[PDB]
Amino acid sequence: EKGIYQTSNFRVQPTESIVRFPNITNLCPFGEVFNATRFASVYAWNRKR
Amino acid sequence: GKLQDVVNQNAQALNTLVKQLSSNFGAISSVLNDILSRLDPPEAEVQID
Amino acid sequence: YQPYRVVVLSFELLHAPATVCGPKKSTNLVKNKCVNFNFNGLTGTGVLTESNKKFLPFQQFGRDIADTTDAVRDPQTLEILDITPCSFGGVSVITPGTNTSNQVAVLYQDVNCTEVNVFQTRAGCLIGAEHVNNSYECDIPIGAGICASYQTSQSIIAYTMSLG
Amino acid sequence: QCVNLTTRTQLPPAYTNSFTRGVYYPDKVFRSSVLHSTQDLFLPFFSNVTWFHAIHTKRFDNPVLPFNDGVYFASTEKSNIIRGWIFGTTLDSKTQSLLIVNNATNVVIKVCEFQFCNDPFLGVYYHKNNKSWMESEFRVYSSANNCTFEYVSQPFLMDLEGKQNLREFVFKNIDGYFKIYSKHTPGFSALEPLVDLPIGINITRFQTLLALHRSPGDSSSGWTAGAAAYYVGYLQPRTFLLKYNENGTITDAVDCALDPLSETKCTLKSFTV
Numbered sequence: 001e002k003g004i005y006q007t008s009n010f011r012v013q014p015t016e017s018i019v020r021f022p023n024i025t026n027l028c029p030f031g032e033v034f035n036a037t038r039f040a041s042v043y044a045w046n047r048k049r
Numbered sequence: 050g051k052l053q054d055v056v057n058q059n060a061q062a063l064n065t066l067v068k069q070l071s072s073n074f075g076a077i078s079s080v081l082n083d084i085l086s087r088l089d090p091p092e093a094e095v096q097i098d
Numbered sequence: 099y100q101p102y103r104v105v106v107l108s109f110e111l112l113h114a115p116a117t118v119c120g121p122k123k124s125t126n127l128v129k130n131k132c133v134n135f136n137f138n139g140l141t142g143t144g145v146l147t148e149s150n151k152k153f154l155p156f157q158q159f160g161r162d163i164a165d166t167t168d169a170v171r172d173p174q175t176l177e178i179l180d181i182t183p184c185s186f187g188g189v190s191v192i193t194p195g196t197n198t199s200n201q202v203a204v205l206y207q208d209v210n211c212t213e214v215n216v217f218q219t220r221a222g223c224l225i226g227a228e229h230v231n232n233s234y235e236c237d238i239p240i241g242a243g244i245c246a247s248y249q250t251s252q253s254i255i256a257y258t259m260s261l262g
Numbered sequence: 263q264c265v266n267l268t269t270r271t272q273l274p275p276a277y278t279n280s281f282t283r284g285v286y287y288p289d290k291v292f293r294s295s296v297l298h299s300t301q302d303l304f305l306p307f308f309s310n311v312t313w314f315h316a317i318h319t320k321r322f323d324n325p326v327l328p329f330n331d332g333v334y335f336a337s338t339e340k341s342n343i344i345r346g347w348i349f350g351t352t353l354d355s356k357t358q359s360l361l362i363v364n365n366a367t368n369v370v371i372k373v374c375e376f377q378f379c380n381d382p383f384l385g386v387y388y389h390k391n392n393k394s395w396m397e398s399e400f401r402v403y404s405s406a407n408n409c410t411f412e413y414v415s416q417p418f419l420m421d422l423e424g425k426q427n428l429r430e431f432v433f434k435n436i437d438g439y440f441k442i443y444s445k446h447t448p449g450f451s452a453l454e455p456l457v458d459l460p461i462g463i464n465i466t467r468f469q470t471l472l473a474l475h476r477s478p479g480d481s482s483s484g485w486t487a488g489a490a491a492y493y494v495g496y497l498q499p500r501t502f503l504l505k506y507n508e509n510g511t512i513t514d515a516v517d518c519a520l521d522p523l524s525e526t527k528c529t530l531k532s533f534t535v
């Protein structure tokens with residue numbers, strides 16, 4: 001019959017997924033465990049946390 | 050005040066319906082996305098219902 | 099007999115809070131598109147637009163009265179981005195009787211349909227229905243004083259309601 | 263080494279009314295011109311906080327007050343007498359304990375095992391040859407075997423002079439996180455969060471540290487108290503009704519369980535009835 005009829009529903013799909021995270025600064029001194037000037041022996045091994 | 054009650058009762062009942070989406074209803078999480086991301090799909094169907 | 103530099107490492111999980119996760123990096127920033135935004139502690143689908151809000155330096159989240167996330171900061175740049183939901187609405191088909199004609203007009207309700215003749219109304223927009231300047235009597239209601247009909251080799255026209 | 267302080271005169275501490283003070287921001291959410299009801303460990307309105315007076319009577323007090331669920335701290339200090347606080351369970355080098363010292367260079371934070379003395383204090387020595395104050399006594403602890411968390415801020419300088427500003431603090435211990443809510447003002451005051459300290463320890467008692475002025479005797483009597491006054495409050499699990507403005511700052515607060523007038527305000531989500 002003549003009139004207006006609601007048939008379906010319209011929605012837009014998301015185009016892409018975007019992931020955010022803060023900056024990677026304030027890092028621990030990890031460069032000294034591999035580039036130290038001298039490594040200790042096995043009987044006096046360094047205990048680092 | 051007669052016209053103020055029609056706007057107030059319709060808006061407050063709408064805000065109640067939005068507030069029902071944050072209810073746990075006995076489940077682990079009120080938000081839907083954390084249920085799938087933390088529970089296995091073979092037993093997630095109890096928490097969905 | 100050549101000496102080697104051997105470094106061992108160990109991982110554990112105590113009741114203390116975590117320190118290192120990946121830090122797993124990020125992606126680029128996309129604005130004015132319907133995307134799945136992810137952040138430090140929230141996930142959702144929405145469109146990001148530039149805002150002029152007055153967020154406190156310690157404040158990151160933003161909620162309305164109905165406790166829905168409206169504006170969150172991107173964590174690297176000091177910038178404010180609004181979140182409005184991706185546009186949705188019902189689909190209404192405006193047609194005359196099938197004994198008269200089979201032509202239809204599709205009304206996409208509550209959407210700016212440049213994202214999906216095209217005539218923009220206050221109830222959405224009309225696809226396949228043209229707009230005429232003269233005003234006729236309403237037979238098929240749409241909303242906001244706009245009514246469609248089947249008149250003049252024949253096509254669906256849209257006009258303003260004649261009150262009398 | 264640890265030393266005890268003699269010539270102490272006992273006096274009962276006074277109690278001062280808190281005129282709607284001690285509120286903070288409960289979360290990170292920006293809110294514009296709304297009225298939000300929260301449920302958090304808050305200081306009750308018109309509560310009897312404990313007033314400690316440090317005036318020269320030779321009154322110098324810093325007892326080991328308990329840390330039940332959160333402590334409100336205030337200081338009407340004009341000479342930087344109040345520096346830091348002890349945090350720990352038993353303070354006998356048997357439980358893992360926290361330390362905050364804001365001495366003359368950095369805000370240094372150690373969280374490890376400390377053999378705390380009977381009278382933990384920060385003593386500063388005065389040199390009369392050049393009219394300058396330099397910190398020389400550090401008798402907080404004895405030794406530490408291993409330490410988990412260590413924090414050192416950027417260096418600065420202090421005047422360290424007793425002059426002839428309200429520093430406000432709220433400390434909480436939730437899910438292994440240490441949170442400090444603080445602001446500096448010269449009533450109503452909303453405290454912004456400053457330092458998030460995710461350590462993961464259990465704290466039962468606390469004790470503040472004062473910078474007594476030293477100049478007329480041995481190390482246990484040659485000192486003066488100066489001018490200092492700090493308030494200690496205790497948070498309680500009660501609900502509020504905050505008033506966020508158009509720019510996010512809290513401008514007013516309503517305690518729900520104070521009087522029956524505000525019970526109507528909390529159940530109607532409005533400030534005018």
Ligand SMILES: *[C@@H]1O[C@H](CO)[C@@H](O)[C@H](O)[C@H]1NC(C)=O
Pocket residue numbers: 034035
């Ligand atoms: C050590 O130093 C060199 C040169 O300074 C650098 O190229 C390298 O990435 C550093 N790290 C390791 C693990 O070798």
Ligand SMILES: *[C@@H]1O[C@H](CO)[C@@H](O)[C@H](O)[C@H]1NC(C)=O
Pocket residue numbers: 023024025174175176
């Ligand atoms: C993030 O850190 C890098 C250093 O690797 C720096 O160049 C960049 O400017 C920082 N981003 C912001 C927004 O500060």
Ligand SMILES: *[C@@H]1O[C@H](CO)[C@@H](O)[C@H](O)[C@H]1NC(C)=O
Pocket residue numbers: 210212
């Ligand atoms: C729809 O988008 C266009 C941009 O081309 C804009 O000019 C128009 O104002 C928008 N309509 C509404 C109702 O916002």
Ligand SMILES: *[C@@H]1O[C@H](CO)[C@@H](O)[C@H](O)[C@H]1NC(C)=O
Pocket residue numbers: 229230231
């Ligand atoms: C309706 O009138 C406007 C001027 O007011 C004109 O620009 C438009 O083309 C007209 N539309 C039709 C279908 O005649």
Ligand SMILES: *[C@@H]1O[C@H](CO)[C@@H](O)[C@H](O)[C@H]1NC(C)=O
Pocket residue numbers: 264265266379380381
């Ligand atoms: C200080 O007094 C306490 C009171 O019991 C005592 O145990 C301690 O040995 C004294 N001396 C110090 C801490 O040097």
Ligand SMILES: *[C@@H]1O[C@H](CO)[C@@H](O)[C@H](O)[C@H]1NC(C)=O
Pocket residue numbers: 363365366367368370397
């Ligand atoms: C302040 O304390 C830190 C750590 O406890 C120490 O390194 C520094 O020397 C102290 N400042 C002075 C002036 O002694």
Ligand SMILES: *[C@@H]1O[C@H](CO)[C@@H](O)[C@H](O)[C@H]1NC(C)=O
Pocket residue numbers: 152507508509
């Ligand atoms: C906007 O924010 C500022 C803080 O910078 C505040 O002083 C001002 O009162 C706010 N505006 C209004 C209308 O409250």
